[PDB]
């Protein structure tokens, strides 16, 4: 018996979801060439 | 008419005197160059 | 009862108002020599040819200086790293012109301050303390060594040691930035984190203890009289401090162990300042801040400036103006 | 101590890694595409390596008007087209 | 009279309003379903 | 040097007035115990 | 305490210390004036800032004539 | 006069040091 | 344009996948809320 | 038992991250300032406002990336997304500097929210609100530097840009143009920040080396208990130590920890005041007496005159690229330069 | 100058030997707890 | 419930960071931002 | 008027110093 | 070892008034001569 | 400056007068 969705859950994913997305964009960038 | 009952003694201990004088002397040492300009 | 043994007992006595100690035996004379020479030079030294080009800079009060502009001026670049005691000069007039006092002061100070740190070890042993307060002070002490000794050695001149003055200090930090790009150097960035962070945690800890002081007084008296020197009980509520701070952030980012909290308080600024002292000490060997000048170019090869390039334009303005008369050749290699 | 499930116990749970072994690479790939497709350039108005200057230009296309600024950068961008 | 920037103003005003009320519509709801006992 | 002549009085008063105040409060504190 | 002629005249103006209207009283209405005043300060600010631009409002010294 | 002023203030600080150390309120236990 | 589906598609599948693995437990938590 | 009270109940529940009424201002504004900075530093240029690249997308790294200030031609425009400049166009808004005002204003309201949080939690827990009070110093710095300074200037352009190297540039601007190191309010700030770091280190070290032996192990951390009444280190031994080493020592734990609040908070407050002066170019640039002497006496040289030459180099060498809107063209022959360099 | 140089040589050597011999005189034993 | 041992989570998480950060440093030398 | 500008400081101190002496002695008298 | 010759010192209000009048009036008299 | 100084001293004395009359040590009959 633990809740799954909490205020905590939300604050966590507020930050973590775009972090990973941003990391993936920044990963693609190392291969951009002029 | 009574004497005013709100009156209170004031204190400044010796350490607070030393701290306060240092503050003032160091402030004076810092700003005096700007006051003389 | 023997003479030497009674002397030894007075040197190491824990009953002297100020502890002397064997480190004190060297500290006291050397700090007195450095202090006395410093005070006299700051007030009355004549101008000193810092950069060896027969262009004396006036640093003392009687020669037209104020508290902000005055300094003891570093010795002549013509001396470089040569030792220049008084008795190596034909006369005091020569010694003054070439910046002798700077050398006397810095050597005695560095020695005396080194012994200051040892003295901290020593009394802690005489008192049955743990021994590492001196390790905390090695961080400032290293910093002083870096700007008065290490940076001259690597550059070859006490003329580039840090001046003993308020504006002299600023002249040193401006030239350092132009010759080493210290702001883009990570060890300097760690110093700033050590110093910003240290002030932050000072404020935090002082505000957190102060917030949780246990009521022992009335509103008409200083809360400070709620603590009596030597009392055995603690004078704030650390669990109340933890319960506020843990909720301000979250529980596990807060300290409930005062020993870990206070050791964190010690280590954060000490380690930041070791690094920033290391920074000066390694830029002394010209391993300089990151250089990203023209690192962004476009498809054609045009330079696309960044903020690093703007910084570089400032550094360039410092470079070309510093010591405007001293360079005859196009590269300032030291 | 507050009644949420402990983090330690979540990131060792099989169920957790079953979801996040999908959600974490999907977001990483998602962000990759945002760049690899060029969408990030167009959303944000960021120049591509080839669109900072026009060919023989060495003039910054610097905004110089407050209420006509939108129209200025629009003009600078056609000076490339 | 009624200029672009005044329309923009009203746009901003209603967006802020939407945002704050929706925020409080959510907060008021959760606080009703998940009450403290006593 | 061609320095601001009022600098002196400013500095003197800047030192004297706040210091005298602290001394006044210390000495009368001591005359109590 | 000393009574004075003027004291007796002003008396009832300092006589209701601690008296309150029950519950929330006029708070809802206060909130309306507060919200109106905010929007109005917004407008005044955005006029001065020139992000609210209005016909016949020339925010310039050249509006002295 | 500016030199006299600067040195005077510094001199006062040094004397203050003397009293702060050797004529401190002596800390007393419990 | 079309790149927006490329970009969003993985995150929907991530949301989809996670929707399906957690749904049974997420409904037990809502029941407990009276 | 009305709705307002019910919401109070829910806002103030003990949970992993406490929310509070102040959470309503804090969390959206903190998340948005932070996300604005990570969005701009990853994807948004400064080409049209500054002639600079400033994102990862463009090839910058963590040190050189920034969210740059708006163009000088924007004045102190709020640069609202829906305002007359951007006209609702997200893209142009990004290109004109809209994220700078977004971050700065949401940051401001976040800071307010954070200080309201310190007030809110302190009331609920029953402690004095000295941690909030302390936090007034960060606030003072932020408003003075990021809001008041540029509001006194020609535009937001001259505020700090939100980035590592951009702030380094802001430091050097202030040296060359304001001679900020010469400013006694900055000096009092330096003494408060360095004084604070000293206090932090010296206090932590003193406690760690006056510890009582309360356990058998060589790791002394185990031997503290958060609810113990007894002090965990000897104030008495600490005081005798410092009295004998330094001459003075603390004897009052309360005063000691208040001083630790006082020193860095005041230093920051002093520096804020000086930056308010610089909003108006109200500088401690010069010492008049030195200039009159040096104008007349070409042999008179101090570190003060030496440093102004440096400021003069800085201004002339950085100004054209740092203030592109001014179209400064300094031909070679007008640049100040010493011999050879 | 040479008078000065000799004097400083003497003063420094004196203090340095106080230091060397002072620490050679059973320094570990001068503590409050356990003496050897 | 506690199936994956935590030390394993730490190592794989650990190497995941090293990988991405290493890519960012590789990219300091290649492509945009490399000076070339 | 071309007066001696050390006269301001001499007059100022002539008043301040002895008056402060007097005040210090009176106030500590009143508190005992 | 406290010293037995310590004495308390006094200045009543009237003496303060008289002393302050003296100083103030001396100042008003000499100041003209100080400014010259 | 000299006028201000003469006027200030004169004004201090008038204020001394007021305190010395109205805030005197009251004479009382021991
Ligand atoms: C402490 C706790 C902190 C808590 C604070 C929480 C955050 C609150 C956020 C508030 C945001 C404030 C927005 C300010 C915008 C601003 O000012 O915007 C500036 C505008 C005025 O705009 C400027 O006006 C200037 C003068 O123009 C005038 O002069 C020109 C030349 O003559 C022409 O004639 C022109 O037409 C005429 O209008 C220039 O043109 C600038 O380019 C233009 O931006 O003021 C206006 O919006 C309004 C100005 C008056 C309102 C008072 C402002 C108070 C803030 C300033 C106080 C510090 C004082 C700074 C001085 C140092
Ligand atoms: C916000 C901006 C900022 C910040 C926070 C800092 C912060 C810092 N800088 Mg950087 N710096 C900046 C901007 C900034 N800088 C800029 C713009 C430039 C370029 C112009 C530089 C250039 C620069 C240089 C060139 C140097 C620094 C250094 C430092 C450090 C100084 C503190 C120190 O050395 O403590 C250490 C402590 C001491 C130095 C003091 C030791 C004290 C001794 C041991 C005892 C003294 C006793 C005394 C004489 C008597 C007292 C007793 C009493 C009775 C009188 C610190 C990390 C310095 C550094 O890293 O040095 C190591 C350094 O050399 N900075
Ligand atoms: C709740 C916290 C919060 C706060 C304090 C702010 C504060 C701010 N935001 Mg941010 N914002 C927030 C949350 C917040 N925002 C959220 C959740 C989002 C995501 C959607 C955003 C997205 C966002 C953007 C995209 C922008 C801002 C901007 C701004 C600034 C201007 C706001 C403005 O002009 O208001 C105007 C509106 C109000 C003050 C509303 C007042 C409400 C009144 C009292 C009620 C009116 C009711 C209505 C008229 C009646 C009904 C009408 C009828 C038809 C029935 C300001 C600093 C702008 C900015 O930073 O510019 C650089 C900007 O461009 N915000
Ligand atoms: C000995 C070196 C030294 C030292 C110690 C200082 C110390 C200081 N300088 Mg000075 N400086 C120096 C050298 C130095 N300076 C030199 C040589 C120069 C060249 C002229 C300057 C130029 C300079 C400028 C130009 C400025 C200073 C300022 C300051 C102050 C900064 C206070 C602060 O914490 O701001 C830090 C900022 C804040 C506390 C604001 C709020 C921060 C909030 C809480 C941020 C929260 C972050 C959030 C959680 C997000 C985190 C995540 C994100 C990182 C990803 C401080 C007194 C500033 C000042 O005086 O301000 C009034 C300033 O503007 N300095
Ligand atoms: C650069 C130095 C510096 C930073 C980064 C910093 C940071 C912080 N200080 C805090 C606290 C404090 N700071 C204090 C004293 C001090 N703080 C100082 C200096 C700093 N303090 C100094 C020198 C002192 C001594 C007086 C106190 C007393 C406290 C606290 O109590 C508090 C804390 O809990 O400490 C543990 C925290 C407040 C958290 C918060 O508001 O979250 C909410 C986040 C918000 C509202 C967003 C703000 C966004 C900012 C303002 C603009 C955007 C910033 C960008 C995203 C990042 C840009 C970075 C580039 C510029 C490089 C935060 C970690
Ligand atoms: C010959 C001539 C004339 C000489 C000229 C020389 C010269 C150049 C002089 C220049 C001087 C100059 C003008 C200096 C200017 C300095 C200046 C900027 C002043 C700052 C002004 C100001 C008010 C700033 C505001 C910020 C401010 C409040 C900072 C205060 C900094 C400060 C005092 C911090 C404390 C530092 C300090 C060393 C404290 C030590 C504390 C100590 C005793 C702790 C030991 C200890 C620790 C424990 O943990 C426990 C438990 C115990 C018990 C204990 O004891
Ligand atoms: C709970 C869930 C967890 C919460 C997740 C929330 C985390 C968000 C925090 C944001 C961190 C901001 C750092 C971003 C750095 C990054 O992206 O670099 C991304 C860049 C990408 O690298 C650049 O890529 C470009 C692509 O065109 C070019 O190739 C450049 O040459 C190359 O440098 O990496 C670096 O510059 C090199 C590594 C340096 C990394 C920064 C060191 C760490 C700094 C500390 C972080 C700041 C905190 C300060 C604390 C004091
Ligand atoms: C453009 C406009 C955009 C702006 C709009 C922004 C909307 C803001 C809304 C923010 C509120 C989010 C928190 C609620 C989420 C949720 O999981 O809680 C309600 C449920 C939580 O579960 C419960 O969790 C509870 C713990 S707690 O309250 O979440 O801490 C527990 O008590 C209970 O047993 C359990 O079932
Ligand atoms: C640097 C200061 C801290 C030094 C470390 C030591 C402090 C010790 C802590 C208390 C006593 C010891 C507890 C032991 C345990 C220990 O010290 O910590 C470990 C702890 C793990 O907690 P769990 O609940 O998983 O397990 C309980 C553990 O205590 C088991 O040992 O870490 C977490 O809290 C992870 C959450 C961080 C991720 C949260 C991200 C989301 C935050 C978003 C909200 C933003 C912040 C708020 C905005 C204002
Ligand atoms: C062998 C050589 C040893 C080195 C000798 C150095 C002597 C100088 C030491 C300080 C004496 C003056 C401190 C007076 C003040 C004084 O006596 O304080 C005494 C005070 C005692 O504190 P307590 O906790 O006992 O008192 C608090 C309550 O009891 C009273 O409210 O100490 C502190 O507050 C510690 C922090 C003060 C730290 C201030 C030190 C800063 C000194 C440096 C400033 C120099 C600028 C000079 C520029 C020219
Ligand atoms: C702006 C805007 C907005 C919002 C936005 C947002 C909110 C976003 C977010 C964002 C975010 C949220 C992001 C994130 C990112 C992240 C990152 C990118 C990270 C990174 C990091 C890293 C890289 C790290 C690493 C490391 C290192 C380097 C060293 C140490 C260790 C570690 C691991 C830490 C909106 C919509 C309203 C609209 C308007 C505009
Ligand atoms: O930085 Mn530039 O480099 Ca080191 O020397 Mn060559 O000039 Mn000169 O003497 Mn001092 O200073
Ligand atoms: Cl120079
Ligand atoms: Cl050369």
Sign, CA dihedral C52-C54-C57-C60, equals positive
For residues J156 and J103, give the distance between their C-alpha atoms in angstroms, rounded to a whole number: 13
What letter would DSSP give residue L4? S
DSSP J215-245: SSSS-GGGG--TT--B-SB-HHHHHHHHHHH
Give the angle I3-I9-I11 at the CA atoms, nearest 5°.
120
CA G42 to CA G36: how far, in whole Å? 10
Residue nearest to atom 1 of ligand 12 (CA): C175
Task: Identify all chain H residues contacting F12, using CB atoms and an 8 Å cutoff.
Answer: 5
Element (H, E) at D60: none
Tokens 């925010």 belong to residue:
G59
Closest partner residue to J236 (CB to CB) among H17, H24, H29 is H29
d(CA G6, CA J333): 83
* CA proximity to C123, closest of J211, K32, J234: K32
Strand partners, C303: C297
Distance between CA E2 and CA M26 in Å, rounded?
Answer: 74
Burial readout N1-35 (b: 16 or more C-beta within 10 A, e: otherwise):
eeeeeeeeeebeeeebbebbeebbeebbeebeebb
CB of B34 closer than 8 Å to CB of J274: no
Q: Give start and end residues of each alpha helix (H) in chain C.
A: 3-11, 21-44, 92-97, 100-127, 133-145, 151-155, 166-180, 186-211, 238-248, 258-283, 307-321
- Can you say whether the dihedral through the CA atoms of C79, C85, C90, C95 is positive or negative? positive
Nearest ligand to the C-alpha atom of residue J25: 3
Q: J295 at the F interface (CB within 8 A)?
A: no
- Rounded Cα distance between J245 and C23, Å, is 12
What residues are paired with J211 via a beta bridge?
Answer: J233
Eight-state DSSP code of residue J160? P
CA distance G16 to G14: 6
Residues 155-214 of J with CB under 8 A from C: 161, 163, 165-166, 168-169, 171-173, 175-176, 181-182, 192-194, 196-211
CA distance H9 to H15: 10
Q: Do M9 and F9 touch (CB under 8 A)?
A: yes
Q: Give yes or no for residue E22 CB within 6 A of ligand 8.
A: yes
Atom number, ligand 5, closest to the C-alpha of residue J196: 25
Give the β-pairing of C71-72 and J162-163.
Answer: unpaired
Q: What is the sign, positive or negative, of the torsion defined by CA atoms of C174, C177, C178, C183?
A: negative
The C-alpha angle J30, J35, J39, rounded to 5 degrees, equals 160
- For residue C72, list its beta bridge partners: C164
| CA distance from start to end of chain D | 62
Q: CA J103 to CA K20: how far, in whole Å?
A: 63
Strand C164-165, strand C71-72: pairing: antiparallel
Give the closest-approach CA distance of N8 to chain O in angstroms: 21
Q: Which chain C residues contact residue H29 at CB under 8 A?
A: 229-230
Per the annotation, where are the binding residues of A for heme? 13
What residues of chain D have any CB closer than 8 angstroms to a CB in chain A?
Answer: 3-5, 24, 27-36, 40, 49
In the block, tokens 């960035």 appear at C189
Q: Are H21 and J247 in contact (CB under 8 A)?
A: yes
Q: Kind and range of the H or E element at C150?
A: none
Residue C230: which domain range?
1-334
**Residue B24 to residue F15, Cβ atoms within 8 A:** yes
Residue J66: strand pairing partners: J163
DSSP track, H1-30: -HHHHHHHHHHHHHHHHHHHHHTSPPP---
Q: Is A25 in the pocket of ligand 7 (CB under 6 A)?
A: no
CB C138 within 8 A of CB C117: yes
**Which residues lie across from C165 on neighbouring strands?**
C71
Q: Which residues have C-beta within 8 Å of that of residue A29, sequence separation ≥ 6?
A: D35, J56, J57, L27, L32
CA-nearest residue to A22 within chain L is L20
How far apart are the C-alpha atoms of C121 and C12, rounded to whole Å? Answer: 13
In the numeric block, which tokens belong to residue C70? 């005055």
Question: Token match 């503590």: residue?
Answer: K31
Which one, of C21, F31, J210, D21, lies nearest residue L12 by Cα?
D21
Q: Which residue of A has its CA nearest to I26?
A: A4
Residue identified by tokens 């964190």 is C264
Which positions in chain D touch I14 (Cβ < 8 Å)? Answer: 22-23, 26-27
Ligand closest to J199 (CA) is: 6
Q: Is the CB of J260 under 6 A from ligand 5?
A: no
Four-CA torsion E20, E26, E28, E34, nearest 10 degrees: -150
Half-sphere exposure of J320 (CA within 13 A, CB side): 12
* Ramachandran area for residue O27 (φ above 0: left; ψ -120 to 50: alpha; else beta): beta
Q: Rounded to whole angstroms, how far apart are CA atoms C212 and J192?
A: 24
First to last CA, chain F: 51
Choose from J4, J75, J83, J156 for mutation: most chain G CBs within 10 A.
J83
CA J142/CA J115 separation, integer angstroms: 13
Element (H, E) at A24: helix A7-29
Query: After which residues does chain A become discontinuous at a C–N distance over 2.5 Å?
Result: none
L-chain residue closest to D18, CA distance: L4
Q: Do J77 and G51 touch (CB under 8 A)?
A: yes
Q: Do J71 and D62 touch (CB under 8 A)?
A: yes
Query: Does ligand 3 lie within 6 Å of residue E16's CB atom?
Result: yes
Rounded CA-CA distance C110/C104 in Å is 10
Spell out the long-range contacts of D51-58 with Cβ–Cβ below 8 A and sequence spacing 24 or more. Answer: D51/D77, D51/D80, D52/C298, D52/C302, D52/C304, D52/J47, D53/C298, D53/C300, D53/C302, D54/D79, D54/D80, D55/C300, D58/C302
Contacts of J42 (CB under 8 A, 6+ apart): A22, A25, A26, J55, J56, J57, J65
Question: What are the phi and psi torsion angles at J327 (to 5°)?
Answer: 40, 50
Cβ neighbourhood burial of J63 (10 Å; 0-12, 13-18, 19+): buried
Q: Which residues of B touch J187 (CB under 8 A)?
A: 30
What's the gap between Cα E23 and its chain centre? 6
Instruction: Tell me the C-alpha distance between J54 and C295, whole Å.
Output: 12
Task: Give me the phi and psi of F7, to 5 degrees please.
Answer: -50, -40
Residue set of the binding site of J for pheophytin a: 118, 131
CB contacts, 8 Å: A21 with chain L: none
- Please return the burial class of M26, using the count of CB atoms within 10 Å of its CB with bins 0-12, 13-18 and 19+: buried
Cα-based distances in Å from L20 to A31, D30, E27, J173: 13, 16, 39, 35
Say yes or no: CB of residue J14 within 6 Å of ligand 8: no
Atom number of ligand 4 nearest to Cα C170 = 17
For residue C14, the 8-state DSSP code is S
**DSSP annotation of J59:** T
**What's the CA gap between J109 and J33, in Å, rounded?**
10
Q: C232: exposed, middle or buried (C-beta count within 10 Å: 0-12, 13-18, 19+)?
A: exposed
Q: Secondary structure of chain D: what % helix, strand, coil (to 5)?
A: 55, 0, 45
Q: Does ligand 7 have an atom closer than 6 angstroms to the CB of A17?
A: no
Nearest to E9 by CA among B20, J174, C299, G43: G43
CA distance F1 to J302: 14
CA-based nearest residue in chain H for residue F9: H5
DSSP per-residue letters across C31-64: HHHHHHHHHHHHHHPPPB-TTSSS-PBP-SGGGT
| Neighboring chain C residues of D58 at a CB cutoff of 8 Å | 302
Contacts of O9 in chain N (CB under 8 A): 24, 27-28, 31
Ligand nearest to the CA of A5: 8
Q: Which residues is chain D interrupted after (C–N above 2.5 Å)?
A: none
Instruction: Write the DSSP assignment of F1-33 as a string of letters.
Output: ----THHHHHHHHHHHHHHHHHHHHHHHHHTT-
Q: Exposed, middle or buried, C54 (CB in 10 Å: 0-12/13-18/19+)?
A: exposed
C188 is annotated as contributing to ligand binding: yes
**Residue pair C111/C26 in contact by the 8 Å Cβ criterion:** yes
Q: Report CA C248 to chain centroid distance, whole Å.
A: 35
Instruction: Tell me, using a 6 A CB cutoff, whether residue A30 lines ligand 7.
Output: yes
CA angle I1–I3–I8, rounded 5-degree value: 110
Confirm if H30 and C227 have CB atoms less than 8 A apart. Answer: no
Phi and psi torsions of J162, nearest 5°: -80, 85
The CA distance from J131 to G23, in Å, is 33
Q: What are phi and psi of C125, to 5 degrees?
A: -70, -45
Q: What is the Å distance from ligand 4's center to C183 Cα? A: 13
C219 φ, ψ (degrees, to nearest 5)? -70, -15
* Those residues with Cβ within 8 angstroms of residue D77's Cβ, 6 or more apart along the chain or in another chain: D51
What's the CA-to-centroid distance between J189 and ligand 6, angstroms?
Answer: 12
Cβ atoms within 10 Å, residue C198: 28
> What separation in angstroms does the CA of D56 have from each of C300, J6, J213, J340?
10, 67, 77, 34
CB L33 within 8 Å of CB C305? no
- Going from the C-alpha of D27 to that of each of D34, J13, O20, the distances in angstroms are 10, 33, 86
Q: Rounded to whole angstroms, how far apart are CA atoms F23 and F28?
A: 9
Decide if J67 contacts J163 (C-beta within 8 A): yes
Of the bound ligands, which one is closest to the alpha carbon of residue C203?
Answer: 5
**Nearest chain F residue to M8, by CA:** F9
Specify whether the CB–CB gap between C117 and C141 falls below 8 A: yes
Q: Does A11 touch chain J (CB under 8 A)?
A: yes
CB contact under 8 A, B29 and C67: yes
Q: How many domains does chain C have?
A: 1
Residues in Cβ contact with C58 at an 8 Å cutoff, skipping those fewer than 6 apart: C46, C47, C64, C65, J300, J301, J302
Q: Report residue K27: phi and psi, to 5°.
A: -60, -40
Torsional class of C156: left (φ above 0), alpha (ψ -120 to 50), beta (otherwise): left
J-contacting chains (≥3 CB pairs under 8 Å) = A, B, C, D, E, F, G, H, L
Cα-based distances in Å from I14 to D19, I4, I23: 8, 16, 14
> Chain F: nearest CA to B7, how far in angstroms?
16
Interatomic CA distance for residues J176 and J283, integer angstroms? 12
Q: Which residues, other chains included, contact J197 with Cβ-Cβ below 8 Å and sequence gap of 6+?
A: C194, C195, C197, C198, C199, C202, C269, C273
Contact predicate N17/O19, CB 8 Å? yes
Distance O6 CA to ligand 9 centre (A): 71
Centre of ligand 5 from the C-alpha of residue J138, in Å = 7
- For Cα atoms F11, J299, H6, give the angle at the middle one, nearest 5 degrees: 15
Question: How many Cα atoms sit within 13 Å of C197 on the Cβ side?
Answer: 17
Domain G1-51 has CATH 1.20.1420.20: no
Distance from CA of C228 to the nearest CA of H (A): 6
Helix, coil or strand: residue C233: strand
Contact between chains at O1 and M8 (C-beta distance less than 8 A): yes
In contact, C47 and C63? CB cutoff 8 Å: yes
Dihedral sign for Cα D67, D73, D76, D77, please: negative
Q: How far apart are CA C272 and CA C201, in angstroms?
A: 13
- Is B23 touching ligand 10 by the criterion CB < 6 Å? no
DSSP assignment of C288-324, as one string? PSP--TT--B-SS--B---HHHHHHHHHHHHHHHTTT
Residues of J at the E interface (Cβ-Cβ below 8 Å)? 3, 6-7, 9-11, 13, 24, 28, 80, 82-84, 87-88
Residue that has been written with the tokens 């749970």 in this structure: D13
Task: Name the residue among J143, J144, J149, J159 with its Cα closest to residue J72.
Answer: J159
Q: How many CB atoms lie within 10 A of CB C128?
A: 14
**What is the CB neighbour count within 10 angstroms for residue C108?**
21
DSSP character string of K1-36: -HHHHHHHHHHHHHHHHHHHHHHHTTGGG-SSS---
């Amino acid at each position: 018996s633990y809740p799954i969705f909490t205020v905590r859950w939300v604050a966590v994913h507020t930050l973590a979801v775009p972090t990973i997305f941003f990391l993936g964009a920044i990963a693609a960038m190392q291969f951009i060439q002029r | 008419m009574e004497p005013n009952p709100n009156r209170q003694p004031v204190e400044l201990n010796r350490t607070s005197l030393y701290l306060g004088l240092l503050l003032i002397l160091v402030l004076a040492l810092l700003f005096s160059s700007y006051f003389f300009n | 009862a023997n003479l030497w043994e009674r002397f030894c007992n007075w040197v190491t006595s824990t009953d002297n108002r100020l502890y002397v100690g064997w480190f004190g035996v060297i500290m006291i004379p050397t700090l007195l020599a450095a202090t006395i020479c410093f005070v006299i030079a700051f007030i009355a030294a004549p101008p000193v040819d810092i950069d060896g080009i027969r262009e004396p800079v006036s640093g003392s009060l009687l020669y037209g200086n104020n508290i902000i502009t005055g300094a003891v001026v570093p010795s002549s670049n013509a001396i470089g790293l040569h030792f220049y005691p008084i008795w190596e000069a034909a006369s005091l007039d020569e010694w003054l012109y070439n910046g002798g006092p700077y050398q006397l002061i810095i050597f005695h100070f560095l020695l005396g301050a080194s012994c200051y740190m040892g003295r901290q070890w020593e009394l802690s042993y005489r008192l049955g303390m743990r021994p590492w307060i001196c390790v905390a002070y090695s961080a400032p002490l290293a910093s002083a060594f870096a700007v008065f000794l290490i940076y001259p050695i690597g550059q070859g001149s006490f003329s580039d040691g840090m001046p003993l003055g308020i504006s002299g200090t600023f002249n040193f930090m401006i030239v350092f930035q132009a010759e080493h790009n210290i702001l883009m150097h990570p060890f300097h960035q760690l110093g700033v984190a050590g110093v910003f962070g240290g002030a932050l945690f000072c404020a935090m800890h002082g505000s957190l203890v102060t917030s949780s002081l246990i009521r022992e007084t009335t509103e008409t008296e200083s809360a400070n009289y709620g603590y009596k020197f030597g009392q055995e009980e603690e004078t704030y509520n650390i669990v109340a401090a933890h319960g506020y701070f843990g909720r301000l952030i979250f529980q596990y980012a807060s300290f409930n162990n005062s020993r870990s909290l206070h050791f964190f308080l010690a280590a954060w600024p000490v380690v930041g300042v070791w690094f920033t002292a290391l920074g000066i000490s390694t830029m002394a060997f010209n391993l300089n801040g990151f250089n990203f000048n023209h690192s962004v170019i476009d498809a054609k090869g045009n330079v696309i400036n960044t903020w690093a390039d703007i910084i570089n334009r400032a550094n360039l303005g410092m470079e070309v103006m510093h010591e405007r008369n001293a360079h005859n050749f196009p590269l300032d290699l030291a | 101590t507050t009644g949420e499930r402990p983090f330690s116990d979540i990131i060792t749970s099989v169920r957790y890694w079953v979801i996040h072994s999908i959600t974490i690479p999907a977001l990483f790939i998602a962000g990759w595409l945002f760049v690899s497709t060029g969408l990030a350039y167009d959303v944000f108005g960021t120049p591509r390596p080839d669109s900072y200057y026009a060919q023989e230009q060495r003039s910054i296309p610097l905004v110089t008007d407050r209420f006509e600024a939108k129209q200025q950068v629009e003009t600078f961008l056609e000076q490339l087209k | 009279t009624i200029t672009p920037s005044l329309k923009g103003f009203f746009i901003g005003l209603l967006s802020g309003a939407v945002v704050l009320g929706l925020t409080f519509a959510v907060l008021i709801a959760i606080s009703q379903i998940d009450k403290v006992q006593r | 040097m061609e320095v601001n002549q009022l600098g002196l009085i400013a500095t003197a008063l800047f030192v004297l007035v706040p210091s005298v105040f602290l001394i006044i409060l210390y000495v009368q504190t001591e005359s109590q115990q | 305490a000393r009574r004075t002629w003027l004291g007796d005249i002003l008396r009832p103006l300092n006589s209701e210390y601690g008296k309150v209207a029950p519950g929330w009283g006029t708070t809802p209405l206060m909130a309306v004036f507060m919200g109106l005043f905010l929007v109005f300060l917004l407008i005044i600010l955005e006029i001065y800032n020139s992000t609210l631009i209005l016909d016949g409002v020339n925010v310039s010294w050249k509006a002295l004539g | 006069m500016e030199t006299i002023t600067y040195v005077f203030i510094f001199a006062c600080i040094i004397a203050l040091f003397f009293f702060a150390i050797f004529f401190r309120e002596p800390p007393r236990i419990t | 344009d079309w790149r927006v589906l490329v970009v969003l598609l993985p995150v929907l599948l991530a949301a989809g996948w996670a929707v399906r693995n957690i749904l049974p437990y997420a409904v037990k938590q809502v029941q407990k809320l009276l | 038992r009305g709705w307002f009270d019910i919401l109070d109940d829910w806002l103030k529940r003990d949970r992993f991250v406490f929310v509070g009424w102040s959470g309503i201002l804090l969390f959206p504004c903190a998340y948005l300032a932070l996300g604005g900075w990570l969005t701009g530093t990853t994807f948004v240029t400064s080409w049209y406002t500054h002639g600079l690249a400033s994102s990862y997308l463009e090839g910058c790294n963590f040190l050189t990336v920034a969210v740059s200030t708006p163009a000088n031609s924007m004045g102190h425009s709020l640069l609202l997304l829906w305002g007359p400049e951007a006209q609702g166009d997200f893209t142009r808004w990004c290109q004109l500097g809209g994220l700078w005002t977004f971050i700065a204003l949401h940051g401001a309201f976040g800071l307010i929210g954070f200080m309201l949080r310190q007030f809110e939690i302190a009331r609920l827990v029953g402690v004095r609100p000295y941690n909030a009070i302390a936090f007034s110093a960060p606030i003072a710095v932020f408003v003075s530097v990021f809001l008041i300074y540029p509001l006194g200037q020609s535009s937001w352009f001259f505020a700090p840009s939100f980035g590592v190297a951009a702030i380094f540039r802001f430091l050097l601007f202030f040296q060359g143009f304001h001679n900020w190191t010469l400013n006694p309010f900055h000096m009092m700030g330096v003494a408060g920040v360095l004084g604070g770091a000293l206090l932090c280190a010296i206090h932590g070290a003193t406690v760690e080396n006056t510890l009582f032996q309360d356990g058998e192990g060589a790791s002394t951390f185990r031997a503290f208990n958060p609810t113990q009444a007894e002090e965990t280190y000897s104030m008495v031994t600490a005081n005798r130590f410092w009295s004998q080493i330094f001459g003075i020592a603390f004897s009052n734990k309360r005063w000691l920890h208040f001083f630790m609040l006082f020193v860095p908070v005041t230093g920051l407050w002093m520096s804020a005041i000086g930056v308010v002066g610089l909003a108006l170019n109200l500088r401690s640039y010069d010492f008049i007496s030195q200039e009159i002497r040096a104008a007349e006496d070409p042999e008179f040289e101090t570190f003060y005159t030496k440093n102004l030459l440096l400021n003069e180099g800085i201004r002339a060498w950085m100004a054209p690229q740092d203030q592109p809107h001014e179209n400064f063209v300094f031909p070679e022959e007008v640049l100040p330069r010493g011999n050879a360099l | 100058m040479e008078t000065l140089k000799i004097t400083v040589y003497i003063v420094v050597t004196f203090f340095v030997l106080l230091f060397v011999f002072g620490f050679l005189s059973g320094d570990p034993a001068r503590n409050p707890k356990r003496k050897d | 419930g506690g199936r994956i041992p935590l030390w394993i989570v730490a190592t794989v998480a650990g190497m995941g960071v090293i990988v991405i950060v290493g890519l960012f440093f590789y990219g300091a030398y290649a492509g945009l931002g490399s000076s070339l």
